[PDB]
């Protein structure tokens, strides 16, 4: 009862040891493994040191403006400041745009503006998630709606070309003058080309409806700017703010203000129905230290130190890709633009499901994904590769030219292990030969060696080893 | 680059002195004041220590045995490890239960619940607003709908007889029958009195609803077996790991396994599907490890101990504040908060709060069961759990207790100069323009600065 | 062709004789028996000449001024008479009221307004239907809706109270600031007594919602001035045309003009563009003709006088069915209608009703306020709109009282025969397989047939 | 007060002069006049004379097995017997196939069966308005829900090629799939060819919709087997029971019966949905005098002088095409295969919009409709075409030539009118100019006593002359 008081200020390591055991195995297996997922990337040290500030413990409902109680002085500064530099870091005059902090994440952020857009069985269209398009632009089946946003909303998905392995914006065009959308979403998460901004546009003013850039993947990109920036056609936009931007885990909607249209001139209204349904709409209490954690990364991502990350980054994916290429490999659309590529699996005889497994086991990480061809979701044709995460850990392109290689040697694995399983096997078995076969297993832990070696001469961010 | 690798290695302090400035303002203010507003806490050293783990960094959807991307071995080790703490804390047995710790809030729990079963459009009841209900609860108007809850369901609220203060179960009994709700919530924002899970759930079950408690205001009373526990009628439970529990900031959902009637539960798949790929996608993790870390200390006596000391300064403050003349409605608390109605001293709620605010003294405006209006609220709430982490005992709630009356009386006067009319806005320009008053709050604050910095703040060593 | 030419020329009887021979059987099954069916009545000679016109053969999309294709001459005309006809047989200046005569039936009335003025899951408020509401008006149970009301809108129930009788208008008036609903529903389909618009419509403003009034079984009442016009509350007025008003099958929506408070009605064109393009195709205007010539009879005195004596009827058969001892539920009727609650003589109107038709005495079976089943109701509503088209007067109901009281005397022994507790096959087993049973009703049934044909009955000289 | 019973009998001529004077006008100008409004026809005598029957007084809620009240021993016989008939008519086995016969009309039909089958929100897919649809398959734009199947369902219509005048399957089958309908209708108010009810069936069942054929327009082609029957492949057929089929109004629902796929079988669901749907769903009291009306008309569909008529019916429609082919008109799809055709005017330099009003004021009826190129839907380029009803009157092929010339003057005279009025002129002034100007007014009047003549030739279907 007395020992109360030196509870809530016992260390982790002393208090609870079983989590802090955790932590530290967890922050080991991150160090000596090659981190090759399209969506992952390591925090800065100041960022983490925000989000475990005294800041959790403060309740406060409302924006800046308004809010519900007092004692905000401070979080107004804090959301303000946050503000400012979202806008400040995009290049956005505050006059034409306007920016909610508040979202939990890139999920709640895309359907608060749905909800504020939309409405109710409103229709809205993405693109497909086969072809590189996400969850929250919608995924449903004849039989089921999956997705929040198709089971509130009525969604219907546009394709790409699988020849060209790009949007087809021609067909876009003519479908949602028969299907009407109120909303259409420009965004994705295994596509390796730009967006047509402009085209998409015009197809939204055709209907009437809203463009929506969910730029979550390559928001990074964007603020250094080598990639296009959607702010130029788009009404909304809106991300998460980890990923490509490095930052802690959040997301922000972006929204033009001011006039919208002439004849005289009608204005926009997106500012107060998006804050309104982020709050009191859909959420309660902003997170305030994920807020603070986003503005240190918003600051961050300002320096020309984090404008030359990135050009490092998509010169990793240009090299990465090149290499495999020579090695024999197939990429959709032929290449990319930005920090990630897909690999179609077809051309060495395999798939990415039974790929993933191999690569995890040699600690190198990455994800399967269907290529706009194939003809079953069962049995995803692709690898989807990012070069974020490793090149915060400093790699450059000599670097990612010897991990293509690990990753060929992780194919070539994976191939002997389906010729030993058979034609009609199911990844359920293939899962169990992988693991209960020395001669496979071998192969693996050799391989696994040669990649935790190359892994350790790279420094891992964050705080010190935890 | 050879600075960019340092840049992601500096401090905070160095790295961004702007943001650091903020924190360390807040963080003093948070010292020297009072913090009475029900729903705020402070979370110990050892939580907050997660939340800056590496952790951040690991991407998982899924849940465990069920991920969609590898590299999940220590995430699947952490996911279950809190799963298990969160059963054993309100000892459940998982045969009996189950629970998800995926939700980001205690909102984003409540909607996927929703979500999951009730379906577009469907019926839902809760606890009216103004009677002490919740935002996720449903809130609408005749000519809107507000919540998120109101947008997509179909909600009606049930009310508190204005008369006892108590909830009106009759009326709802006879309302459920009409309405035919599919789900029924048992939750409340500022209600000082237990619920009758054991009859929502009679009522449920006549209409063949689910009966959803979301315990967010009192799961730590609950876990320290202080006031009745809602698992023993409800079908899922949600709950908010901040607030009475102490954690971090997220949410967690329980929901029933097993045998319901031979028919059998289907709450987990439906309720798991909800929260991703339904309405979420990667988990927080580090906001898991935090709320693993608070349920191991939620289990210690030393919480236990806590927790009978939140309830009992409750007590004490209620008791000195009815006897300085102030009316508690429904004539006390069963846990750690109480409404005071304000009414029975001449001024609202709406102006007391402003006052007490200017004297470090936090706080909050809430509408009395009676309230004829919605602009100018009757009540205050207070909660006893911040402050008790800090260390107060009855004794110290008692001096609170004064202070808090010394506003009153602060904000009645600046009321006597406005005249017994006149907009909300007057008076708070008379309170900061005028002599004898700006200086009364000033000399207060003094006082109450002077006492708050006699107890600790948990947290980081010192930001 | 040479015979094609013909075919088309055929009279009925000739072409064919199938379909002849039943409507002749018909006819005749019409002439002997008892119509004691508040909902049915006979159509008078001119109105049923109308429907076989060549009127059938004009296809005429749209309205008046509005149409889609060309040679609509008279069919404008005809529609513009009706229209006339309908608000004056109501005495309603076509400056603050409107009418739409396309409906094709009483139910597609109603979905049209709630189409325009509701909008999709929006709220609905109507009396229960074992309370004397009609399906239209919102039905459904906790696992299903039923009514396409309550399919596409969200409904929710008002009751009587069964103490009384009546409709209970404070619990409405709570339940409606709970429930917000956007339309409140006045009108039934067995209810004795009159409405109370006026309060209804202070509860429907209160909420900002619609009054709309389904007057579809008193609606000839309304036009001899014998019962007080919805018309002087409500914003929406819908009706079928037969029942009360004797016409031909078909409906009408009646609706506001000018100004509402300066706000104006908007009414009219909601209401003209649900029903189409919204929800009709062609209208039928065979049946807009036959409204037309009903609506001209029902302004004559001979309407007046006729519907007085409606009334007056149902006031002696009432009377003299309290004298035999039966329980009228609300003790009385203000209109055409009463329920008459069976229990008062140990059986159920689902018995009853069986027994009665076999002694073709025709009525239908209700549940009363009370009924704590809807498996076994307990009344029989009864109306006399039909037998007094055929000239029954006070002392011939006095007749029809006593055969009906033979009848519940019969239902009841064939009951004493199977027992305190038997299901209703058992009941109808024993009533069809008895001498003594089967002989009783082949005798009251020659009594009921004898004193039938006594009176004529209106239509077409003889089919 | 006596007189009241000498109300009840007194005929419409004394009872009520004001529209016995209205009905005897109308009657005139059916007679005098040429209708070749494709959805028009005359009934006859025998069916008209069942409307007015004494069934109209019989109220009778729910079907004959089960009903609310009691006395429906006759009503059961005609109910049952309509039903026995319809399925007989359509050469259907009642283990096969089952009918409700409680429809109003044709809209309602419809309306129950998404009711039924599709649920609040479902979706459907239908034939484009401007396509050759009908409403009731689903009518919006991009910001309003026109038609109620749009106002309750989630509808997407499917368009024909503008090229070939054709249904494009192709482009139906690849949406179909981004869309996932619950229900696809097969049905056209302006489609002068065969619909592929094989190929809408595959592609039904290959996203495991409903497919429904709303035969309304060739109803009676498909009785005299003059046109392939939907009953082959739909699950559910609905109907006007007016139009070609020439009855009274109201319609009819045909839905199948027993076991649906294997696999061990799963069985037909749709007797049941659709009967609670059409009540206690949707309607109330059915309208039995309609029933009667429909019995018989099914009767007279089955003889041979109806088959007969039938094949008149195409035979003339061609003789019309052919002659309004070498007059220099262009034809959609260049021809058609059923009993209209769809006149694309602007091979003649003028549009169907004014068109039908100076052929509406020579007494030749028909309405505008716009041809798959059209750029507009305010000045639609043709004139839908039907000869069902003047066949009814006994026109043949010699017959149908001079009409086609009788049309053609039309053509010319609207032509003269419209290089009178200007190039950026208005309808609303077109109307204008085509009323006070005796100069066109005067070849009104002539051409107008010409097609007058013409068709006071021809008997009129009915009653005397009534
Ligand atoms: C990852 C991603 C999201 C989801 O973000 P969460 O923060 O995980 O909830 C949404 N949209 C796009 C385009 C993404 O890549
Ligand atoms: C506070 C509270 C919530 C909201 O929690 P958030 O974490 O702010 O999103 C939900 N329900 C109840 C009953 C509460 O008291
Ligand atoms: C009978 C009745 C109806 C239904 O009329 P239909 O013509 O059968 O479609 C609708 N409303 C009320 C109040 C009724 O009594
Ligand atoms: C005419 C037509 C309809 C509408 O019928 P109504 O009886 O006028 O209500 C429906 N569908 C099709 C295909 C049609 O041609």
């Not at 790699?395 to 990612?400: A, H, I």
């Not at 290689?405 to 899962?431: C, M, N, S, W, Y």
Request: proline fraction near 5%.
């Amino acid at each position: 009862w007395s020992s109360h008081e030196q509870m809530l200020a016992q260390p982790l390591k002393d208090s609870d040891a079983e989590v802090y055991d955790i932590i530290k195995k967890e922050s080991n297996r991150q160090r000596v493994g090659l981190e090759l997922i399209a969506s992952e990337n390591f925090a800065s040290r100041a960022v983490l040191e925000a989000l475990g500030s005294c800041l959790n413990n403060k309740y406060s409902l409302g924006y800046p403006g308004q809010r519900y109680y007092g004692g905000t002085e401070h979080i107004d500064e804090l959301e303000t400041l946050c503000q400012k530099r979202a806008l400040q870091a995009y290049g956005l005059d505050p006059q034409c745009w306007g920016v909610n902090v508040q979202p939990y994440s890139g999920s709640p952020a895309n359907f608060a503006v749905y909800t504020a857009l939309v409405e109710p069985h409103g229709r809205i269209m993405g693109l497909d998630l086969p072809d590189g398009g996400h969850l929250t632009h919608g995924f449903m089946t004849d039989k089921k709606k999956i997705s929040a946003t198709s089971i509130f909303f009525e969604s219907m998905a546009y394709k790409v070309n699988p020849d060209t392995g790009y949007i087809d914006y021609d067909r876009l065009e003519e479908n949602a003058r028969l299907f009407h959308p109120k909303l259409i979403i420009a965004g994705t998460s295994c596509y390796s080309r730009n967006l047509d901004y402009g085209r998409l546009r015009k197809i939204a003013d055709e209907n009437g409806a809203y463009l929506m850039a969910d730029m979550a993947h390559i928001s990074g990109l964007v603020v250094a700017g080598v990639v296009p920036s959607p702010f130029e056609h788009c009404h909304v936009v809106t991300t998460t703010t980890h990923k490509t931007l490095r930052g802690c885990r959040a997301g922000m909607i972006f929204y033009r203000r001011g006039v919208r249209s002439v004849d005289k001139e009608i204005l926009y209204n997106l500012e107060s129905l998006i804050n309104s349904a982020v709050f009191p709409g859909l959420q309660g209490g902003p997170h305030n230290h994920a807020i603070a954690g986003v503005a240190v990364a918003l600051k961050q991502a300002m320096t020309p130190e984090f404008k030359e990350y990135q050009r490092q980054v998509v010169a990793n994916c240009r090299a990465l890709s090149a290499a495999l290429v020579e090695l024999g490999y197939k990429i959709v659309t032929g290449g990319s633009d930005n920090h990630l590529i897909l690999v179609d699996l077809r051309s060495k005889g395999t798939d990415g499901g039974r790929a993933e497994k191999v690569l995890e086991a040699c600690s190198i990480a990455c994800n399967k994904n269907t290529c706009p061809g194939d003809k079953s979701a069962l049995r995803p044709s692709g690898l989807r590769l990012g070069t974020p995460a490793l090149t915060s850990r400093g790699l450059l392109e000599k670097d990612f030219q010897k991990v293509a290689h690990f990753i060929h040697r992780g194919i070539e694995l994976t191939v002997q292990i389906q010729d030993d399983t058979g034609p009609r096997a199911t990844l359920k078995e293939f899962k169990e030969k992988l693991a209960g076969d020395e001669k496979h297993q071998r192969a693996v832990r050799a391989l696994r060696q040669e990649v935790e070696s190359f892994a350790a001469l790279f420094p891992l961010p964050g705080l010190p080893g935890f």
